[model samples]
Target: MTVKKLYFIPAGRCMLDHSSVNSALTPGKLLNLPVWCYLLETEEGPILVDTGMPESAVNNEGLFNGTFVEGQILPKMTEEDRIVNILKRVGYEPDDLLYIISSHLHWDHAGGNGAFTNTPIIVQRTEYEAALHREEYMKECILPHLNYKIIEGDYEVVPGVQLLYTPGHSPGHQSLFIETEQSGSVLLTIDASYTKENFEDEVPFAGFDPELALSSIKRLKEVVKKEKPIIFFGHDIEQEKSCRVFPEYI
Candidate 1:
Protein backbone atom coordinates (compact mmCIF):
# COMPACT_ATOMS: atom_id res chain seq x y z
CA MET A 1 0.00 0.00 0.00
CA THR A 2 1.44 3.34 -1.07
CA VAL A 3 0.34 5.54 1.85
CA LYS A 4 1.58 9.09 1.61
CA LYS A 5 0.74 12.19 3.65
CA LEU A 6 -2.57 12.51 5.51
CA TYR A 7 -3.71 16.07 6.15
CA PHE A 8 -6.33 17.04 8.79
CA ILE A 9 -7.68 20.28 7.46
CA PRO A 10 -9.78 22.65 9.61
CA ALA A 11 -12.67 23.66 7.37
CA GLY A 12 -14.97 25.52 9.76
CA ARG A 13 -16.70 25.69 13.16
CA CYS A 14 -20.25 25.37 14.53
CA MET A 15 -21.64 27.17 17.56
CA LEU A 16 -24.23 25.00 19.24
CA ASP A 17 -25.31 23.59 22.57
CA HIS A 18 -23.28 20.67 23.86
CA SER A 19 -26.47 18.62 24.12
CA SER A 20 -26.63 18.38 20.34
CA VAL A 21 -23.40 16.39 20.55
CA ASN A 22 -24.16 14.48 23.76
CA SER A 23 -27.87 14.33 24.36
CA ALA A 24 -28.99 15.25 27.92
CA LEU A 25 -25.41 15.05 29.17
CA THR A 26 -24.33 18.68 28.89
CA PRO A 27 -27.43 20.70 28.22
CA GLY A 28 -26.65 24.40 28.32
CA LYS A 29 -22.94 24.42 27.55
CA LEU A 30 -22.43 26.52 24.45
CA LEU A 31 -19.84 24.79 22.34
CA ASN A 32 -18.15 25.72 19.14
CA LEU A 33 -17.29 22.38 17.57
CA PRO A 34 -14.39 22.52 15.17
CA VAL A 35 -15.17 21.00 11.78
CA TRP A 36 -12.50 19.03 9.87
CA CYS A 37 -11.88 17.59 6.40
CA TYR A 38 -9.25 14.90 6.07
CA LEU A 39 -7.15 14.50 2.90
CA LEU A 40 -5.17 11.35 2.33
CA GLU A 41 -2.46 11.70 -0.34
CA THR A 42 -2.17 8.21 -1.69
CA GLU A 43 -0.54 6.33 -4.61
CA GLU A 44 -3.93 6.36 -6.29
CA GLY A 45 -4.55 10.06 -5.68
CA PRO A 46 -5.89 12.28 -2.90
CA ILE A 47 -9.00 10.97 -1.13
CA LEU A 48 -10.93 13.59 0.81
CA VAL A 49 -13.09 12.59 3.77
CA ASP A 50 -15.96 14.95 4.59
CA THR A 51 -16.25 18.41 3.03
CA GLY A 52 -17.25 20.32 6.20
CA MET A 53 -20.21 22.71 5.79
CA PRO A 54 -21.37 24.30 2.53
CA GLU A 55 -20.10 27.62 1.18
CA SER A 56 -23.35 29.33 2.18
CA ALA A 57 -22.88 28.13 5.76
CA VAL A 58 -19.75 30.24 6.07
CA ASN A 59 -20.51 33.19 8.43
CA ASN A 60 -24.15 32.20 8.52
CA GLU A 61 -26.56 31.44 11.34
CA GLY A 62 -28.08 27.95 11.28
CA LEU A 63 -28.59 26.01 7.98
CA PHE A 64 -31.03 25.59 5.05
CA ASN A 65 -34.04 27.81 5.77
CA GLY A 66 -34.53 27.27 9.52
CA THR A 67 -33.86 23.54 9.77
CA PHE A 68 -32.65 24.44 13.25
CA VAL A 69 -34.01 26.81 15.84
CA GLU A 70 -32.48 30.26 16.45
CA GLY A 71 -29.84 28.98 18.85
CA GLN A 72 -29.56 25.47 17.47
CA ILE A 73 -26.39 25.42 15.31
CA LEU A 74 -25.01 28.80 14.36
CA PRO A 75 -22.21 28.24 11.83
CA LYS A 76 -18.96 30.18 12.03
CA MET A 77 -16.48 30.02 9.19
CA THR A 78 -14.05 32.39 7.52
CA GLU A 79 -13.19 32.64 3.80
CA GLU A 80 -9.88 30.87 4.48
CA ASP A 81 -11.75 28.02 6.18
CA ARG A 82 -13.66 27.18 2.99
CA ILE A 83 -13.02 23.58 1.84
CA VAL A 84 -11.76 24.87 -1.56
CA ASN A 85 -9.27 27.18 0.16
CA ILE A 86 -8.21 24.44 2.57
CA LEU A 87 -7.74 22.08 -0.38
CA LYS A 88 -5.60 24.67 -2.17
CA ARG A 89 -3.58 25.34 0.96
CA VAL A 90 -2.87 21.61 1.10
CA GLY A 91 -1.62 21.84 -2.57
CA TYR A 92 -4.49 20.19 -4.45
CA GLU A 93 -7.55 21.46 -6.24
CA PRO A 94 -11.07 19.93 -6.29
CA ASP A 95 -10.44 18.57 -9.83
CA ASP A 96 -7.43 16.51 -8.58
CA LEU A 97 -9.50 14.24 -6.34
CA LEU A 98 -9.78 10.45 -6.54
CA TYR A 99 -12.96 10.31 -4.48
CA ILE A 100 -14.74 12.31 -1.78
CA ILE A 101 -15.84 9.97 1.02
CA SER A 102 -18.55 11.66 3.00
CA SER A 103 -18.61 10.26 6.54
CA HIS A 104 -22.32 10.99 6.39
CA LEU A 105 -24.47 13.48 4.51
CA HIS A 106 -25.41 15.82 7.32
CA TRP A 107 -25.57 19.53 6.51
CA ASP A 108 -22.24 19.97 8.24
CA HIS A 109 -20.45 16.98 6.74
CA ALA A 110 -21.45 17.17 3.08
CA GLY A 111 -21.98 20.90 2.85
CA GLY A 112 -19.29 21.46 0.25
CA ASN A 113 -20.48 18.66 -2.06
CA GLY A 114 -21.73 21.25 -4.50
CA ALA A 115 -18.15 22.40 -5.16
CA PHE A 116 -16.81 19.35 -6.98
CA THR A 117 -17.68 18.52 -10.57
CA ASN A 118 -17.21 14.96 -11.90
CA THR A 119 -15.51 13.47 -8.85
CA PRO A 120 -17.75 10.78 -7.35
CA ILE A 121 -18.60 11.17 -3.67
CA ILE A 122 -18.59 7.78 -1.92
CA VAL A 123 -21.42 7.12 0.56
CA GLN A 124 -23.61 4.33 1.89
CA ARG A 125 -26.73 3.49 -0.15
CA THR A 126 -29.08 3.96 2.83
CA GLU A 127 -27.51 7.29 3.72
CA TYR A 128 -28.05 8.53 0.17
CA GLU A 129 -31.64 7.31 0.30
CA ALA A 130 -32.17 8.95 3.70
CA ALA A 131 -30.90 12.32 2.46
CA LEU A 132 -33.52 12.32 -0.32
CA HIS A 133 -36.52 10.86 1.53
CA ARG A 134 -35.88 11.65 5.18
CA GLU A 135 -35.94 15.33 6.05
CA GLU A 136 -33.13 15.01 8.59
CA TYR A 137 -30.22 15.27 6.12
CA MET A 138 -29.95 18.27 3.88
CA LYS A 139 -30.86 17.41 0.27
CA GLU A 140 -28.94 20.47 -0.94
CA CYS A 141 -25.72 18.84 0.19
CA ILE A 142 -25.89 15.72 -2.05
CA LEU A 143 -28.25 16.72 -4.79
CA PRO A 144 -28.15 16.87 -8.63
CA HIS A 145 -24.70 18.31 -9.37
CA LEU A 146 -22.42 15.75 -7.67
CA ASN A 147 -21.70 12.12 -8.54
CA TYR A 148 -22.05 9.50 -5.79
CA LYS A 149 -20.83 5.89 -5.43
CA ILE A 150 -23.18 4.39 -2.84
CA ILE A 151 -21.85 1.21 -1.26
CA GLU A 152 -24.05 -1.36 0.51
CA GLY A 153 -21.99 -2.37 3.54
CA ASP A 154 -18.39 -2.14 4.79
CA TYR A 155 -15.87 -1.47 2.01
CA GLU A 156 -12.15 -1.23 1.49
CA VAL A 157 -11.76 2.18 -0.13
CA VAL A 158 -8.15 1.42 -1.08
CA PRO A 159 -5.51 -1.06 0.10
CA GLY A 160 -4.93 0.31 3.60
CA VAL A 161 -7.91 2.64 3.80
CA GLN A 162 -11.18 1.10 4.99
CA LEU A 163 -14.64 2.43 5.64
CA LEU A 164 -16.41 0.90 8.63
CA TYR A 165 -20.20 0.78 8.30
CA THR A 166 -20.98 2.46 11.62
CA PRO A 167 -24.46 3.81 11.21
CA GLY A 168 -25.77 5.84 14.17
CA HIS A 169 -25.25 9.52 13.69
CA SER A 170 -27.04 9.18 10.38
CA PRO A 171 -28.93 6.26 8.87
CA GLY A 172 -25.79 4.92 7.16
CA HIS A 173 -22.92 6.82 8.74
CA GLN A 174 -19.43 5.42 8.19
CA SER A 175 -16.09 5.88 9.91
CA LEU A 176 -12.49 5.61 8.68
CA PHE A 177 -9.80 3.10 9.56
CA ILE A 178 -6.54 4.08 7.87
CA GLU A 179 -3.20 2.30 7.94
CA THR A 180 -0.67 5.06 7.56
CA GLU A 181 3.11 4.89 7.28
CA GLN A 182 4.10 7.12 10.19
CA SER A 183 0.86 7.34 12.14
CA GLY A 184 0.27 3.59 12.09
CA SER A 185 -3.40 2.44 12.18
CA VAL A 186 -5.69 5.43 12.73
CA LEU A 187 -9.43 5.42 13.36
CA LEU A 188 -11.44 8.51 12.60
CA THR A 189 -14.81 8.16 14.38
CA ILE A 190 -16.41 10.80 12.27
CA ASP A 191 -19.51 12.12 14.11
CA ALA A 192 -20.36 8.56 15.13
CA SER A 193 -18.92 9.81 18.39
CA TYR A 194 -18.63 13.56 18.57
CA THR A 195 -16.26 14.04 21.51
CA LYS A 196 -13.98 11.74 23.47
CA GLU A 197 -16.60 11.63 26.21
CA ASN A 198 -19.18 10.37 23.76
CA PHE A 199 -17.10 7.26 23.00
CA GLU A 200 -15.40 6.91 26.39
CA ASP A 201 -18.75 7.11 28.16
CA GLU A 202 -20.16 4.55 25.73
CA VAL A 203 -22.62 7.12 24.45
CA PRO A 204 -22.70 8.39 20.89
CA PHE A 205 -23.62 11.94 19.98
CA ALA A 206 -27.44 12.08 19.67
CA GLY A 207 -28.11 10.25 16.46
CA PHE A 208 -31.00 8.45 14.68
CA ASP A 209 -31.27 5.51 17.06
CA PRO A 210 -29.81 4.93 20.53
CA GLU A 211 -29.35 1.18 20.06
CA LEU A 212 -27.57 1.62 16.73
CA ALA A 213 -25.34 4.24 18.32
CA LEU A 214 -24.36 1.90 21.16
CA SER A 215 -23.73 -0.94 18.72
CA SER A 216 -21.55 1.32 16.57
CA ILE A 217 -19.62 2.33 19.66
CA LYS A 218 -19.26 -1.34 20.56
CA ARG A 219 -17.99 -2.12 17.05
CA LEU A 220 -15.44 0.68 17.29
CA LYS A 221 -14.31 -0.54 20.71
CA GLU A 222 -13.88 -4.03 19.31
CA VAL A 223 -11.63 -2.55 16.62
CA VAL A 224 -9.68 -0.85 19.40
CA LYS A 225 -9.36 -4.13 21.28
CA LYS A 226 -7.93 -5.76 18.14
CA GLU A 227 -6.14 -3.15 15.99
CA LYS A 228 -5.68 -0.53 18.74
CA PRO A 229 -5.61 2.40 16.35
CA ILE A 230 -4.95 5.98 17.46
CA ILE A 231 -8.57 7.12 17.73
CA PHE A 232 -9.68 10.62 16.79
CA PHE A 233 -13.11 11.94 17.68
CA GLY A 234 -15.04 13.74 14.97
CA HIS A 235 -15.77 17.10 16.63
CA ASP A 236 -13.59 16.94 19.72
CA ILE A 237 -12.15 20.38 20.40
CA GLU A 238 -9.32 18.76 22.34
CA GLN A 239 -8.41 16.30 19.60
CA GLU A 240 -8.48 19.15 17.09
CA LYS A 241 -5.48 20.70 18.84
CA SER A 242 -3.56 17.40 18.87
CA CYS A 243 -3.91 17.01 15.09
CA ARG A 244 -1.65 19.24 12.97
CA VAL A 245 -3.81 21.20 10.56
CA PHE A 246 -2.94 21.39 6.86
CA PRO A 247 0.36 23.16 5.95
CA GLU A 248 1.33 20.48 8.55
CA TYR A 249 0.27 16.82 8.51
CA ILE A 250 0.93 13.48 10.23
Candidate 2:
Protein backbone atom coordinates (compact mmCIF):
# COMPACT_ATOMS: atom_id res chain seq x y z
CA MET A 1 0.00 0.00 0.00
CA THR A 2 1.16 3.54 -0.77
CA VAL A 3 1.53 5.66 2.33
CA LYS A 4 0.39 9.28 2.47
CA LYS A 5 2.20 12.61 2.15
CA LEU A 6 2.58 14.81 5.23
CA TYR A 7 2.42 18.61 5.26
CA PHE A 8 3.71 20.94 7.98
CA ILE A 9 1.27 23.80 8.05
CA PRO A 10 2.07 26.65 10.44
CA ALA A 11 -0.95 28.73 11.34
CA GLY A 12 0.49 31.33 13.68
CA ARG A 13 2.92 32.13 16.50
CA CYS A 14 2.67 32.79 20.24
CA MET A 15 4.85 34.10 23.02
CA LEU A 16 5.03 32.00 26.19
CA ASP A 17 7.73 32.73 28.67
CA HIS A 18 9.92 29.82 29.74
CA SER A 19 8.57 29.62 33.28
CA SER A 20 4.98 29.27 32.13
CA VAL A 21 5.01 26.12 29.96
CA ASN A 22 8.00 24.60 31.65
CA SER A 23 9.67 25.16 35.00
CA ALA A 24 12.44 27.78 34.93
CA LEU A 25 15.00 25.93 32.83
CA THR A 26 15.60 29.18 31.00
CA PRO A 27 14.68 31.86 33.50
CA GLY A 28 13.94 35.44 32.38
CA LYS A 29 13.46 34.29 28.80
CA LEU A 30 10.58 33.81 26.38
CA LEU A 31 9.94 31.09 23.85
CA ASN A 32 8.33 32.30 20.65
CA LEU A 33 6.48 29.13 19.68
CA PRO A 34 4.89 28.31 16.38
CA VAL A 35 1.25 27.24 16.12
CA TRP A 36 1.67 24.25 13.85
CA CYS A 37 -1.27 22.33 12.40
CA TYR A 38 -0.54 19.33 10.25
CA LEU A 39 -2.23 17.84 7.17
CA LEU A 40 -1.97 14.31 5.86
CA GLU A 41 -3.09 13.31 2.37
CA THR A 42 -4.13 9.72 2.84
CA GLU A 43 -6.13 7.15 0.90
CA GLU A 44 -8.70 7.21 3.67
CA GLY A 45 -8.93 11.03 3.45
CA PRO A 46 -7.34 14.28 4.59
CA ILE A 47 -6.61 14.28 8.32
CA LEU A 48 -5.76 17.34 10.41
CA VAL A 49 -3.66 17.00 13.55
CA ASP A 50 -4.51 20.20 15.41
CA THR A 51 -6.37 23.38 14.54
CA GLY A 52 -4.01 26.27 15.28
CA MET A 53 -5.27 29.47 16.93
CA PRO A 54 -8.90 30.61 17.17
CA GLU A 55 -10.62 33.42 15.28
CA SER A 56 -11.44 35.19 18.52
CA ALA A 57 -7.78 35.45 19.37
CA VAL A 58 -7.23 37.38 16.17
CA ASN A 59 -10.47 39.40 15.98
CA ASN A 60 -11.72 39.78 19.54
CA GLU A 61 -8.93 40.72 21.91
CA GLY A 62 -11.26 41.12 24.88
CA LEU A 63 -11.84 37.38 25.05
CA PHE A 64 -8.27 36.75 26.24
CA ASN A 65 -7.36 40.21 27.53
CA GLY A 66 -7.54 39.40 31.22
CA THR A 67 -5.81 36.02 31.49
CA PHE A 68 -3.64 35.11 28.49
CA VAL A 69 -3.09 38.74 27.65
CA GLU A 70 -1.86 39.72 31.11
CA GLY A 71 0.24 36.60 31.29
CA GLN A 72 2.00 37.62 28.02
CA ILE A 73 0.71 34.53 26.24
CA LEU A 74 -0.09 36.70 23.26
CA PRO A 75 -1.05 35.37 19.85
CA LYS A 76 0.59 36.71 16.70
CA MET A 77 -1.97 35.73 14.10
CA THR A 78 -3.39 37.46 11.06
CA GLU A 79 -6.34 36.74 8.76
CA GLU A 80 -3.89 34.52 6.89
CA ASP A 81 -3.14 32.58 10.06
CA ARG A 82 -6.60 31.01 10.25
CA ILE A 83 -6.64 27.27 9.60
CA VAL A 84 -9.04 27.62 6.65
CA ASN A 85 -6.69 30.05 5.01
CA ILE A 86 -3.73 27.78 5.64
CA LEU A 87 -5.64 24.87 4.05
CA LYS A 88 -6.40 27.01 1.01
CA ARG A 89 -2.68 27.60 0.47
CA VAL A 90 -2.32 23.87 -0.12
CA GLY A 91 -5.40 23.50 -2.35
CA TYR A 92 -7.63 21.90 0.30
CA GLU A 93 -10.86 23.30 1.67
CA PRO A 94 -12.20 23.03 5.20
CA ASP A 95 -15.09 20.88 3.91
CA ASP A 96 -12.65 18.51 2.21
CA LEU A 97 -11.22 17.54 5.58
CA LEU A 98 -12.67 14.36 7.05
CA TYR A 99 -11.01 13.94 10.43
CA ILE A 100 -9.46 16.22 13.05
CA ILE A 101 -7.34 14.63 15.77
CA SER A 102 -6.86 16.89 18.73
CA SER A 103 -3.77 16.49 20.94
CA HIS A 104 -5.78 18.18 23.68
CA LEU A 105 -8.46 20.86 23.90
CA HIS A 106 -6.17 23.64 25.02
CA TRP A 107 -6.83 27.04 23.48
CA ASP A 108 -3.90 27.16 21.03
CA HIS A 109 -4.13 23.50 20.05
CA ALA A 110 -7.88 23.05 19.58
CA GLY A 111 -8.87 26.67 19.14
CA GLY A 112 -9.64 26.52 15.41
CA ASN A 113 -12.09 23.63 15.82
CA GLY A 114 -15.10 25.89 15.35
CA ALA A 115 -13.96 26.42 11.76
CA PHE A 116 -14.89 22.84 10.89
CA THR A 117 -18.37 22.14 12.16
CA ASN A 118 -19.04 19.51 9.48
CA THR A 119 -15.87 17.55 10.08
CA PRO A 120 -15.70 14.77 12.65
CA ILE A 121 -13.22 15.29 15.50
CA ILE A 122 -11.42 12.45 17.25
CA VAL A 123 -10.33 13.02 20.85
CA GLN A 124 -9.80 11.07 24.02
CA ARG A 125 -12.96 10.58 26.15
CA THR A 126 -11.27 12.11 29.18
CA GLU A 127 -10.31 15.22 27.22
CA TYR A 128 -13.79 15.58 25.74
CA GLU A 129 -15.42 15.38 29.16
CA ALA A 130 -12.95 17.89 30.58
CA ALA A 131 -13.77 20.31 27.80
CA LEU A 132 -17.50 19.83 28.35
CA HIS A 133 -17.22 21.26 31.84
CA ARG A 134 -15.42 24.32 30.46
CA GLU A 135 -18.55 25.19 28.48
CA GLU A 136 -17.97 28.90 28.36
CA TYR A 137 -14.47 28.46 26.95
CA MET A 138 -15.28 25.37 24.87
CA LYS A 139 -18.11 27.15 23.08
CA GLU A 140 -15.64 29.61 21.60
CA CYS A 141 -13.82 26.81 19.79
CA ILE A 142 -15.89 23.61 19.60
CA LEU A 143 -19.51 24.14 18.68
CA PRO A 144 -22.43 21.95 19.87
CA HIS A 145 -23.31 20.89 16.31
CA LEU A 146 -19.93 19.35 15.63
CA ASN A 147 -19.46 15.56 15.60
CA TYR A 148 -17.06 14.10 18.15
CA LYS A 149 -15.60 10.60 18.25
CA ILE A 150 -14.65 10.17 21.88
CA ILE A 151 -12.13 7.36 22.24
CA GLU A 152 -9.96 5.85 24.94
CA GLY A 153 -6.32 4.74 25.17
CA ASP A 154 -4.36 4.47 21.91
CA TYR A 155 -5.92 4.20 18.44
CA GLU A 156 -5.03 3.90 14.77
CA VAL A 157 -6.78 6.65 12.84
CA VAL A 158 -5.64 5.12 9.56
CA PRO A 159 -3.29 2.45 8.22
CA GLY A 160 -0.15 4.58 8.48
CA VAL A 161 -1.22 6.94 11.25
CA GLN A 162 -1.68 6.16 14.96
CA LEU A 163 -2.53 8.10 18.10
CA LEU A 164 -0.42 7.48 21.19
CA TYR A 165 -2.18 8.15 24.50
CA THR A 166 0.40 10.21 26.38
CA PRO A 167 -1.76 11.98 28.92
CA GLY A 168 -0.28 14.35 31.57
CA HIS A 169 -0.38 17.90 30.30
CA SER A 170 -4.08 17.31 30.16
CA PRO A 171 -6.25 14.30 31.03
CA GLY A 172 -6.32 12.99 27.44
CA HIS A 173 -3.30 14.53 25.77
CA GLN A 174 -1.96 12.48 22.84
CA SER A 175 0.89 12.36 20.34
CA LEU A 176 0.76 11.18 16.74
CA PHE A 177 2.93 8.77 14.80
CA ILE A 178 2.75 8.74 11.03
CA GLU A 179 4.51 6.18 8.85
CA THR A 180 4.93 7.75 5.47
CA GLU A 181 6.30 6.13 2.36
CA GLN A 182 8.79 8.91 1.73
CA SER A 183 9.62 10.12 5.20
CA GLY A 184 9.59 6.77 6.98
CA SER A 185 8.39 7.45 10.56
CA VAL A 186 7.29 10.80 11.94
CA LEU A 187 6.33 11.28 15.58
CA LEU A 188 4.56 14.41 16.81
CA THR A 189 4.98 14.83 20.57
CA ILE A 190 2.54 17.63 21.13
CA ASP A 191 2.80 19.10 24.63
CA ALA A 192 3.65 15.64 25.93
CA SER A 193 7.03 17.33 26.03
CA TYR A 194 6.82 20.99 25.10
CA THR A 195 10.42 21.04 23.92
CA LYS A 196 13.24 18.57 23.35
CA GLU A 197 14.83 20.05 26.47
CA ASN A 198 11.88 18.95 28.58
CA PHE A 199 11.83 15.56 26.85
CA GLU A 200 15.44 14.90 27.77
CA ASP A 201 15.12 15.95 31.41
CA GLU A 202 11.58 14.62 31.86
CA VAL A 203 10.55 17.83 33.58
CA PRO A 204 6.89 18.25 34.49
CA PHE A 205 5.15 21.58 34.08
CA ALA A 206 3.03 23.26 36.72
CA GLY A 207 -0.60 22.08 37.38
CA PHE A 208 -0.06 18.61 35.82
CA ASP A 209 0.46 15.28 37.52
CA PRO A 210 4.25 15.14 37.64
CA GLU A 211 4.37 11.37 37.91
CA LEU A 212 2.09 10.84 34.95
CA ALA A 213 3.99 13.43 32.95
CA LEU A 214 7.32 11.69 33.57
CA SER A 215 5.81 8.34 32.60
CA SER A 216 4.53 9.77 29.32
CA ILE A 217 8.00 11.06 28.50
CA LYS A 218 9.45 7.64 29.26
CA ARG A 219 6.89 6.05 26.95
CA LEU A 220 7.86 8.44 24.18
CA LYS A 221 11.54 7.76 24.83
CA GLU A 222 10.90 4.05 24.35
CA VAL A 223 9.05 4.72 21.13
CA VAL A 224 11.88 6.93 19.94
CA LYS A 225 14.37 4.18 20.61
CA LYS A 226 12.24 1.57 18.84
CA GLU A 227 11.12 3.55 15.81
CA LYS A 228 14.03 5.97 15.29
CA PRO A 229 11.54 8.40 13.80
CA ILE A 230 11.85 12.11 13.06
CA ILE A 231 10.34 13.74 16.15
CA PHE A 232 8.33 16.97 16.29
CA PHE A 233 8.29 18.96 19.49
CA GLY A 234 5.17 20.88 20.52
CA HIS A 235 6.20 24.48 21.31
CA ASP A 236 9.93 24.62 20.68
CA ILE A 237 10.70 27.80 18.82
CA GLU A 238 14.38 27.10 18.25
CA GLN A 239 13.69 23.49 17.28
CA GLU A 240 10.84 24.43 14.96
CA LYS A 241 13.07 27.01 13.25
CA SER A 242 15.52 24.23 12.47
CA CYS A 243 12.84 22.44 10.41
CA ARG A 244 11.18 23.19 7.11
CA VAL A 245 7.77 24.87 7.40
CA PHE A 246 4.58 24.47 5.32
CA PRO A 247 4.74 23.31 1.67
CA GLU A 248 7.45 21.03 3.12
CA TYR A 249 7.24 17.67 4.86
CA ILE A 250 9.46 15.14 6.64
- Indicate which candidate wins on TM-score: 1
Give each prediction's root-mean-square deviation over alpha carbons.
1.6, 2.2
Q: What is candidate 2's lDDT per residue for 1-250, written digit by digit as tens? A: 4347888888888876677667755656666778888888889888999998888778543445656345546677888988888888888887898799998888888888888878889999888877778532446555677788889999998898889999877778899988997889888998888878778876656435667878898999999999999988888877876877667766
Quantify all predictions' global Cα lDDT against the true fold: 0.83, 0.80
TM-score of 1: 0.94
Off by over 4 Å in 1: 62-65
**Separate clash counts for every candidate:** 0, 0
Please give each candidate's TM-score. 0.94, 0.91
Question: Using alpha carbons, what is the TM-score of model 2?
Answer: 0.91
The lDDT of model 2 is: 0.80
| Candidate 1 C-alpha error for residue 66, in Å | 3.5
Candidate 2 at residue 190, lDDT? 87
